[PDB]
Write a protein that binds this DNA or RNA. Structure first.
Ligand SMILES: [Mg+2]
Ligand SMILES: [Mg+2]
Ligand SMILES: [Mg+2]
Ligand SMILES: [Mg+2]
Ligand SMILES: [Mg+2]
Ligand SMILES: [Mg+2]
Ligand SMILES: [Mg+2]
Ligand SMILES: [Mg+2]
Ligand SMILES: [Mg+2]
Ligand SMILES: [Mg+2]
Ligand SMILES: [Mg+2]
Ligand SMILES: [Mg+2]
Ligand SMILES: [Mg+2]
Ligand SMILES: [Mg+2]
Ligand SMILES: [Mg+2]
Ligand SMILES: [Mg+2]
Ligand SMILES: [Mg+2]
Ligand SMILES: [Mg+2]
Ligand SMILES: [Mg+2]
Ligand SMILES: [Mg+2]
Ligand SMILES: [Mg+2]
Ligand SMILES: [Mg+2]
Ligand SMILES: [Mg+2]
Ligand SMILES: [Mg+2]
Ligand SMILES: [Mg+2]
Ligand SMILES: [Mg+2]
Ligand SMILES: [Mg+2]
Ligand SMILES: [Mg+2]
Ligand SMILES: [Mg+2]
Ligand SMILES: [Mg+2]
Ligand SMILES: [Mg+2]
Ligand SMILES: [Mg+2]
Ligand SMILES: [Mg+2]
Ligand SMILES: [Mg+2]
Ligand SMILES: [Mg+2]
Ligand SMILES: [Mg+2]
Ligand SMILES: [Mg+2]
Ligand SMILES: [Mg+2]
Ligand SMILES: [Mg+2]
Ligand SMILES: [Mg+2]
Ligand SMILES: [Mg+2]
Ligand SMILES: [Mg+2]
Ligand SMILES: [Mg+2]
Ligand SMILES: [Mg+2]
Ligand SMILES: [Mg+2]
Ligand SMILES: [Mg+2]
Ligand SMILES: [Mg+2]
Ligand SMILES: [Mg+2]
Ligand SMILES: [Mg+2]
Ligand SMILES: [Mg+2]
Ligand SMILES: [Mg+2]
Ligand SMILES: [Mg+2]
Ligand SMILES: [Mg+2]
Ligand SMILES: [Mg+2]
Ligand SMILES: [Mg+2]
Ligand SMILES: [Mg+2]
Ligand SMILES: [Mg+2]
Ligand SMILES: [Mg+2]
Ligand SMILES: [Mg+2]
Ligand SMILES: [Mg+2]
Ligand SMILES: [Mg+2]
Ligand SMILES: [Mg+2]
Ligand SMILES: [Mg+2]
Ligand SMILES: [Mg+2]
Ligand SMILES: [Mg+2]
Ligand SMILES: [Mg+2]
Ligand SMILES: [Mg+2]
Ligand SMILES: [Mg+2]
Ligand SMILES: [Mg+2]
Ligand SMILES: [Mg+2]
Ligand SMILES: [Mg+2]
Ligand SMILES: [Mg+2]
Ligand SMILES: [Mg+2]
Ligand SMILES: [Mg+2]
Ligand SMILES: [Mg+2]
Ligand SMILES: [Mg+2]
Ligand SMILES: [Mg+2]
Ligand SMILES: [Mg+2]
Ligand SMILES: [Mg+2]
Ligand SMILES: [Mg+2]
Ligand SMILES: [Mg+2]
Ligand SMILES: [Mg+2]
Ligand SMILES: [Mg+2]
Ligand SMILES: [Mg+2]
Ligand SMILES: [Mg+2]
Ligand SMILES: [Mg+2]
Ligand SMILES: [Mg+2]
Ligand SMILES: [Mg+2]
Ligand SMILES: [Mg+2]
Ligand SMILES: [Mg+2]
Ligand SMILES: [Mg+2]
Ligand SMILES: [Mg+2]
Ligand SMILES: [Mg+2]
Ligand SMILES: [Mg+2]
Ligand SMILES: [Mg+2]
Ligand SMILES: [Mg+2]
Ligand SMILES: [Mg+2]
Ligand SMILES: [Mg+2]
Ligand SMILES: [Mg+2]
Ligand SMILES: [Mg+2]
Ligand SMILES: [Mg+2]
Ligand SMILES: [Mg+2]
Ligand SMILES: [Mg+2]
Ligand SMILES: [Mg+2]
Ligand SMILES: [Mg+2]
Ligand SMILES: [Mg+2]
Ligand SMILES: [Mg+2]
Ligand SMILES: [Mg+2]
Ligand SMILES: [Mg+2]
Ligand SMILES: [Mg+2]
Ligand SMILES: [Mg+2]
Ligand SMILES: [Mg+2]
Ligand SMILES: [Mg+2]
Ligand SMILES: [Mg+2]
Ligand SMILES: [Mg+2]
Ligand SMILES: [Mg+2]
Ligand SMILES: [Mg+2]
Ligand SMILES: [Mg+2]
Ligand SMILES: [Mg+2]
Ligand SMILES: [Mg+2]
Ligand SMILES: [Mg+2]
Ligand SMILES: [Mg+2]
Ligand SMILES: [Mg+2]
Ligand SMILES: [Mg+2]
Ligand SMILES: [Mg+2]
Ligand SMILES: [Mg+2]
Ligand SMILES: [Mg+2]
Ligand SMILES: [Mg+2]
Ligand SMILES: [Mg+2]
Ligand SMILES: [Mg+2]
Ligand SMILES: [Mg+2]
Ligand SMILES: [Mg+2]
Ligand SMILES: [Mg+2]
Ligand SMILES: [Mg+2]
Ligand SMILES: [Mg+2]
Ligand SMILES: [Mg+2]
Ligand SMILES: [Mg+2]
Ligand SMILES: [Mg+2]
Ligand SMILES: [Mg+2]
Ligand SMILES: [Mg+2]
Ligand SMILES: [Mg+2]
Ligand SMILES: [Mg+2]
Ligand SMILES: [Mg+2]
Ligand SMILES: [Mg+2]
Ligand SMILES: [Mg+2]
Ligand SMILES: [Mg+2]
Ligand SMILES: [Mg+2]
Ligand SMILES: [Mg+2]
Ligand SMILES: [Mg+2]
Ligand SMILES: [Mg+2]
Ligand SMILES: [Mg+2]
Ligand SMILES: [Mg+2]
Ligand SMILES: [Mg+2]
Ligand SMILES: [Mg+2]
Ligand SMILES: [Mg+2]
Ligand SMILES: [Mg+2]
Ligand SMILES: [Mg+2]
Ligand SMILES: [Mg+2]
Ligand SMILES: [Mg+2]
Ligand SMILES: [Mg+2]
Ligand SMILES: [Mg+2]
Ligand SMILES: [Mg+2]
Ligand SMILES: [Mg+2]
Ligand SMILES: [Mg+2]
Ligand SMILES: [Mg+2]
Ligand SMILES: [Mg+2]
Ligand SMILES: [Mg+2]
Ligand SMILES: [Mg+2]
Ligand SMILES: [Mg+2]
Ligand SMILES: [Mg+2]
Ligand SMILES: [Mg+2]
Ligand SMILES: [Mg+2]
Length: 275
RNA sequence: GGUGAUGGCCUACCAAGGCGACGACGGGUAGCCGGCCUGAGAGGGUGACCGGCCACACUGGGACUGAGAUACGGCCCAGACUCC
RNA sequence: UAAUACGUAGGGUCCGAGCGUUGUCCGGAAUUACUGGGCGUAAAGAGCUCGUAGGUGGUUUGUCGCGUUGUUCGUGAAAACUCA
RNA sequence: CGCAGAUAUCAGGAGGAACACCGGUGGCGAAGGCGGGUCUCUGGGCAGUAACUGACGCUGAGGAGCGAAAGCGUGGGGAGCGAACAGGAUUAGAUACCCUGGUAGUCCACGCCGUAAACGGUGGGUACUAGGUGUGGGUUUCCUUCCUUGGGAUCCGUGCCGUAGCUAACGCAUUAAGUACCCCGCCUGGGGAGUACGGCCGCAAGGCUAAAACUCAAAGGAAUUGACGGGGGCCCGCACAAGCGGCGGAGC
RNA sequence: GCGGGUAAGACCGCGUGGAGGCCCGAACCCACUUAGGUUGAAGACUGAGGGGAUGAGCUGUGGGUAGGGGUGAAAGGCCAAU
RNA sequence: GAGAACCUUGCCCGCCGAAAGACCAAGGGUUCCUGGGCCAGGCCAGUCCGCCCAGGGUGAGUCGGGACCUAAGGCGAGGCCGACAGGCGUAGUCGAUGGACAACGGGUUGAUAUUCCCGUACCCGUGUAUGUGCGUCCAUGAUGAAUCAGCGGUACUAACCAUCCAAAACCACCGUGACCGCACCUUUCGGGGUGUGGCGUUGGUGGGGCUGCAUGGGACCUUCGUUGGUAGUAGUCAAGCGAUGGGGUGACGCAGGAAGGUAGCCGUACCGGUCAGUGGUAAUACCGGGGUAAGCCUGUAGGGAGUCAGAUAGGUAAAUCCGUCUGGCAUAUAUCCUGAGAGGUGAUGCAUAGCCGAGUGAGGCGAAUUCGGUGAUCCUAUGCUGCCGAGAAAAGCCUCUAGCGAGGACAUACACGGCCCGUACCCCAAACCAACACAGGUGGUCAGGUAGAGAAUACUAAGGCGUACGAGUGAACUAUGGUUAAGGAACUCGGCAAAAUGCCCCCGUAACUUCGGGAGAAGGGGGACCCACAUGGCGUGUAAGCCUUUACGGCCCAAGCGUGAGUGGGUGGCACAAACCAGUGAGAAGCGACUGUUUACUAAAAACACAGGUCCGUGCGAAGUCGCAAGACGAUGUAUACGGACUGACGCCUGCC
RNA sequence: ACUAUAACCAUCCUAAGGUAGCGAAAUUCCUUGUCGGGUAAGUUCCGACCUGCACGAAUGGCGUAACGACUUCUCAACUGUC
RNA sequence: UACAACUUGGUAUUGGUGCUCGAUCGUAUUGGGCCUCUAACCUCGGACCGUAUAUCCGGUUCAGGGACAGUGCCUGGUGGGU
């Protein structure tokens, strides 16, 4: 749920968080951790590519099985549903009857002690992965893939996941959280059930310190920049920039997608706003 | 310890209680009563005189005298008033 | 414009060594409804429930009689009211 | 809104709200109110056996829970409808009635707010008091075909009309305003004003508790007859319609 | 956790717990006021005071970002007193 | 010494003493010591110097940098891309500020020291050969698996009992695509409507048998209940070391609390000395000491975790290892791991205050070497609890196996064997960075006593300094300060500055409010010393005592030590938080929510920034970036995410075009 | 309906012609606007009126507890600032 | 006045069939539009190999796309980003 904090000090009056009362562990499975580090928003050159990002609290990366096909026909137990900061959602560790422990995303309403099976024969209960040949139309799924074994790439959205629509030939149409419908091949794999932490968006940062914690640096407003460094820069006082807003590099709002994409044909329609 | 006489009347130490919605404590009003006016009555109002009590003595306090002091024209101090 | 309602006259009415005005208080005021109110619309049943305290109890079998009336002497000052 | 191919019309797809007929002066719920179905958990009410407890009863200041719609927060949803808002129109004037559209809201989840002509304008519970006409619910019992709103009786809820009574009257009339009992809310002429100040609640809009001054000598209720009605039924007139001829032009 | 309280609550008193860009205040980091200095002790200080002071903190360490570019909690600041 | 404030020695005085002392790193590189001289340098002289001139001085298997491993990142064979140059990045190899392996105390010269000497230890590397003692070249154990003869009432194939449905329309009615018409109505006759008759149906079954196929029953020939000889006759080795491979291990945040110890201190005892120009102390009292390591033993407080057998293909192959599942044994202070600290040895040693002869000062002798109590920011701790913002890698080590194999494993007497380079000095400073012997900056370690909360502050030890111009003069005037009659902001733009309050404990504290605050709001009272309560509460805890899974064990703890607080009585003083140190307060309002950041070197705000929202873009080899390219960021993220822009907590709102 | 008003209608034109809130304010030039509070005296301040030259609702409006080496003003102590 | 970037078409990396539309209702005009397919091309899907270790890369197989896309050259737009 949500616990609103009590306004002891001024910088802590609006800070409301979600209670992680469900976790069971306090130190991640060490056989499945790799080194990571705040990249600082810099490419091979070292020149900053994306602003606002860099610094913050160091984090430890863990490899988690979005490839969930390497094991089929072998069940696993939901060992412990632990928390990784690196990702929005929650990762739950599974014990396989084989003897592997692999990390995966924790779907909504999943609790320790349930059973997990991964294959074309699995049941339809939430938390099971299986190519879309074997999944009824209309169900709600997540952690979807974009081709037969390229690794799930879409709908990791903590709190939202895709909706299957209809199978024709070798493609399936998906209603998906951006409000868009995508034709995609049906040989991919997916899992049934909404993702967990549906209340994550309820967090109120409330304190610049924690924003820094999560890592992003401050944003320097437009009309305050100097005119040399940015189109709206300048103006003794507050002046709109005398022109329609524009990105710091001279391109204003409006369409940006490069159509003609290999997936341009695969897309059905385009997202709607204010409809 | 104190009082003509028991008692937080006063003192010390113990326990945290006592009073409170069958109206505490707070605020405005006003001497109480036998009585006076009214009303068939219950009741309402009210406290002129007389009378039974209370409290007061230029305003605030305190104490002596003795069987008996709120001691009106008894005492002391402080303020006001008037005067030598 | 033609007053039994203004003023003047007469005449009359009530009262009277007092006659009016004013003001306080009771009455009719059952107009704070105990005696002795009402709640549909005239003013009023809260929006409807459970239920603490309080208020109230479906029967007879049994005592103490503290609610009660029962009587006897035993208090109720004087003054005021009622009788002669 | 259409000649960029509208409407219509046919195939397919999407998606949200709501379930006609059953469906009524009917069920239930204490009250708001509640009905397309299926399953899941579950509340309340009634009939016969009357087995058992045995004065446990009633209702309730404060308190606390429930409580239509509108409104507010958070995040989803958002077909239709639709405050506000634009235009078109009538009108002297229309910031409306009407038309085109159309954002809040309307729906979901959790919190809120607690007011309605929240009406049966009637607090709850018990006992008694002539009937007539129906529904639904459950029981029995007999003409007995034992088919059968065939007949009898019973108790619960539910519509209308009616005696006596009561009532200001309209009206109620055993599901009372009757005749009593027990408890609780409430009112004392109309404005002022359910508002100002205050206390409490609410994040708010505001809600709850609840004043005085000054002014008026009436405001209100049911009912009687008029009058009138861009309210209804039945009637009549160069009233209308069909015809001629006319005045409003000129002089007189 | 216990005692009140619910029917479960919720709520409250009591003790424990010690969160906090919480408070006062040294090191450290800053630069608000005044004074002196302004051919100074100093190409920016000294002294009195002055704010934060468990954090968006500070600091050693070594690395990358090169000029019309970097960087820039944005002042036309910094990028070796420029 | 020619000269002497400035140097050497001595006496006193002052100053720092979380440094103005002592160690290092970075840095500098002879500034270290000794000897000689004083032109030049030192803001003066100068015998002195961080001057110059000569000589001397730096001693390591155990400290540090390479032999080791790695982060950020750099380089980069091939490779990809690029007009050239080059830019990328794989395998790899570099890259400390990290991880890994071993040292203590005393003594020593004018300079070095965990390096030299003394005494006592250690851990790594090679080898010895014997004592344990183990095979391959004998052979015993557990099993284990690649081979010939069939079965799952389930149920291939003609049927039976029972259940709902109808393909080749019989019987009956009815509506009538359309045809034949019987009576009436209608425009004068026509069309047409109504009622009915015969079919036909705009809307083709029932009855019965032959045959063939479809749905279950037993059985016929081929499919078993793994052996009957054989072939424990023969090919296999594990020892011992075996990886560019696998697994554990190493291996990790902030904050908080408490307990146990030490460094270290205080008093006691013990030891040695003590007679102080002065009243009184010749020991009751004073001065000084009272230390002692690593390693090797012990393994406590304490922290974490339970023991055997079978099978499982999962960890790129295989595994006795690690994970998993089954049973057996276990909840035993059982077992294992970790582990500061304490006791013993280390140590009959050393050092030691001082005694003696000997002076630029060395040398021999050498007493006591206990206790308690306080107590850390140091250690247990990389631990425990709790939070979200969820807190490196690799190596070494242990262990498991892939490729071998007729000689390794384990200890020890043994004398052997361990590099090179740094090592002097300075190192909050006249030695580094500032052009200087400059009031500046510079990271880590050590942290005494009395007061105090203290790492502030005041005075002091250890130890080092008075940092290089002096002497003399009551003037202005400037600067640093102290005091001031009365008035108290009247100056002045401004109460600028100055003055002022200032601690602890108690009482009581408004408006307002986001119910936290406001609030230390304001305001007030006590505070010194002595005595008593008291030989007080508290902690600590000895002897003794008690108990026992008997030990570094549990109960009491007289004794002893340390000990806040308060109440009463008394007393001195102007004053009792007297020093240093140590909030001015309140009222009304403007702007900004605040913590915060910024114009180094004139502006710290109302600017910036943010936490809140809004709009838009962004379908994942994403949007947008850097890059004439590969490619990298975005992100090892996925619309509850990311980018861009605007406003800026929160509440009411955010109108019209 | 005494007195100054527009609170109603007609004009043009553009798309409309500033709603709530506040308002001589950080915006108000006349201007020291006018009035009242504070002072003996107040061109600053506070509180109102609205004739807003030239406010105004995300280059956000209005209030807002707390915060501030922020702005203005007043008061008691305080003092050689005078 | 240009240019970076973004965007169009033709042309090339370029293949085939079926349909439907034209100027010398039964005789003729070669290209446009669509549906397919693999084979050019892409693939940041998979799985092998170089390899004893290689997420780069190269080759092989398959899988998805597929004559699109990308890329050049000409060209038109937009173009204070320079
Ligand atoms: Mg907040
Ligand atoms: Mg952990
Ligand atoms: Mg990782
Ligand atoms: Mg570069
Ligand atoms: Mg950004
Ligand atoms: Mg950092
Ligand atoms: Mg998360
Ligand atoms: Mg979408
Ligand atoms: Mg911005
Ligand atoms: Mg700026
Ligand atoms: Mg720049
Ligand atoms: Mg520009
Ligand atoms: Mg500007
Ligand atoms: Mg401007
Ligand atoms: Mg734009
Ligand atoms: Mg007695
Ligand atoms: Mg008493
Ligand atoms: Mg006593
Ligand atoms: Mg009196
Ligand atoms: Mg009486
Ligand atoms: Mg009476
Ligand atoms: Mg009476
Ligand atoms: Mg009386
Ligand atoms: Mg008398
Ligand atoms: Mg009297
Ligand atoms: Mg008496
Ligand atoms: Mg008196
Ligand atoms: Mg007297
Ligand atoms: Mg008298
Ligand atoms: Mg007298
Ligand atoms: Mg007259
Ligand atoms: Mg008269
Ligand atoms: Mg008369
Ligand atoms: Mg009267
Ligand atoms: Mg009454
Ligand atoms: Mg009424
Ligand atoms: Mg009512
Ligand atoms: Mg109400
Ligand atoms: Mg009696
Ligand atoms: Mg008697
Ligand atoms: Mg009597
Ligand atoms: Mg008498
Ligand atoms: Mg009488
Ligand atoms: Mg249609
Ligand atoms: Mg019975
Ligand atoms: Mg009751
Ligand atoms: Mg009751
Ligand atoms: Mg009540
Ligand atoms: Mg009550
Ligand atoms: Mg409730
Ligand atoms: Mg409730
Ligand atoms: Mg509604
Ligand atoms: Mg609603
Ligand atoms: Mg609203
Ligand atoms: Mg809401
Ligand atoms: Mg919404
Ligand atoms: Mg919708
Ligand atoms: Mg409408
Ligand atoms: Mg309109
Ligand atoms: Mg509409
Ligand atoms: Mg109401
Ligand atoms: Mg209703
Ligand atoms: Mg009711
Ligand atoms: Mg009743
Ligand atoms: Mg009736
Ligand atoms: Mg009657
Ligand atoms: Mg009734
Ligand atoms: Mg009645
Ligand atoms: Mg009244
Ligand atoms: Mg009212
Ligand atoms: Mg109130
Ligand atoms: Mg109210
Ligand atoms: Mg009426
Ligand atoms: Mg009538
Ligand atoms: Mg006519
Ligand atoms: Mg005429
Ligand atoms: Mg005429
Ligand atoms: Mg605490
Ligand atoms: Mg702070
Ligand atoms: Mg302070
Ligand atoms: Mg000087
Ligand atoms: Mg300089
Ligand atoms: Mg300073
Ligand atoms: Mg000062
Ligand atoms: Mg400070
Ligand atoms: Mg401060
Ligand atoms: Mg901070
Ligand atoms: Mg360079
Ligand atoms: Mg430039
Ligand atoms: Mg600027
Ligand atoms: Mg500028
Ligand atoms: Mg510079
Ligand atoms: Mg000399
Ligand atoms: Mg000092
Ligand atoms: Mg210090
Ligand atoms: Mg010190
Ligand atoms: Mg250095
Ligand atoms: Mg060096
Ligand atoms: Mg020297
Ligand atoms: Mg010399
Ligand atoms: Mg010389
Ligand atoms: Mg010289
Ligand atoms: Mg020399
Ligand atoms: Mg190469
Ligand atoms: Mg490279
Ligand atoms: Mg590389
Ligand atoms: Mg290396
Ligand atoms: Mg290194
Ligand atoms: Mg040395
Ligand atoms: Mg040494
Ligand atoms: Mg920690
Ligand atoms: Mg401790
Ligand atoms: Mg002496
Ligand atoms: Mg000693
Ligand atoms: Mg395994
Ligand atoms: Mg060796
Ligand atoms: Mg060397
Ligand atoms: Mg040295
Ligand atoms: Mg040195
Ligand atoms: Mg030094
Ligand atoms: Mg120099
Ligand atoms: Mg110097
Ligand atoms: Mg210096
Ligand atoms: Mg420093
Ligand atoms: Mg310290
Ligand atoms: Mg000193
Ligand atoms: Mg010293
Ligand atoms: Mg001077
Ligand atoms: Mg002076
Ligand atoms: Mg003085
Ligand atoms: Mg003065
Ligand atoms: Mg000042
Ligand atoms: Mg305050
Ligand atoms: Mg406060
Ligand atoms: Mg205070
Ligand atoms: Mg003991
Ligand atoms: Mg014992
Ligand atoms: Mg025991
Ligand atoms: Mg004194
Ligand atoms: Mg403001
Ligand atoms: Mg500020
Ligand atoms: Mg600040
Ligand atoms: Mg800032
Ligand atoms: Mg700044
Ligand atoms: Mg500066
Ligand atoms: Mg500056
Ligand atoms: Mg400044
Ligand atoms: Mg900001
Ligand atoms: Mg917003
Ligand atoms: Mg925005
Ligand atoms: Mg937006
Ligand atoms: Mg892209
Ligand atoms: Mg702003
Ligand atoms: Mg103003
Ligand atoms: Mg303002
Ligand atoms: Mg202004
Ligand atoms: Mg002005
Ligand atoms: Mg003015
Ligand atoms: Mg002034
Ligand atoms: Mg204006
Ligand atoms: Mg303007
Ligand atoms: Mg707007
Ligand atoms: Mg705006
Ligand atoms: Mg703007
Ligand atoms: Mg604003
Ligand atoms: Mg406010
Ligand atoms: Mg003043
Ligand atoms: Mg003075
Ligand atoms: Mg072309
Ligand atoms: Mg082509
Ligand atoms: Mg241009
Ligand atoms: Mg230009």
């Amino acid at each position: 749920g949500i616990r609103k904090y009590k306004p002891t000090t001024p910088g802590r009056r609006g800070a409301s968080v979600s209670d992680f009362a469900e976790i069971t562990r306090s130190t991640p499975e060490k056989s499945l951790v790799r080194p990571l580090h705040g990249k600082g928003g810099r490419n091979a050159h070292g020149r900053i590519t994306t602003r606002h990002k860099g610094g913050g609290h160091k984090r430890a990366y863990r490899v988690i099985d979005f490839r969930r096909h390497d094991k089929d026909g072998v069940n696993a137990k939901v060992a412990h549903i632990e928390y990784d900061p690196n990702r929005t959602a929650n990762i739950a560790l599974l014990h396989y009857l084989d003897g592997e422990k692999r990390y995966i995303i924790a779907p909504q309403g999943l609790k320790q002690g349930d059973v997990i099976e991964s294959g074309a024969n699995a049941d339809i209960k939430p938390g099971n992965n299986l190519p879309l040949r074997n999944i009824p139309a209309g169900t709600v799924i997540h952690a979807v893939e974009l081709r037969p074994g390229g690794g799930a790439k879409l709908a990791r959205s903590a709190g939202v996941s895709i909706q299957l629509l209809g199978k024709e030939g070798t493609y399936a149409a998906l209603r998906m959280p951006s409000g868009e419908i995508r034709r995609v091949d049906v040989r991919c794999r997916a899992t049934v059930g909404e993702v967990g932490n549906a209340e994550q968006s309820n967090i109120n940062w409330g304190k610049a310190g924690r924003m820094r914690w999560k890592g992003k640096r401050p944003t320097v407003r437009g009309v305050v920049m100097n005119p040399v460094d940015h189109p709206h820069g300048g103006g003794e006082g507050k002046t709109s920039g005398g022109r329609h807003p524009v990105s710091p590099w001279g391109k204003p709002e409006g369409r940006t997608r490069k159509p003609n994409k290999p997936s341009d044909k695969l897309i059905v329609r385009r997202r709607r706003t204010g409809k």
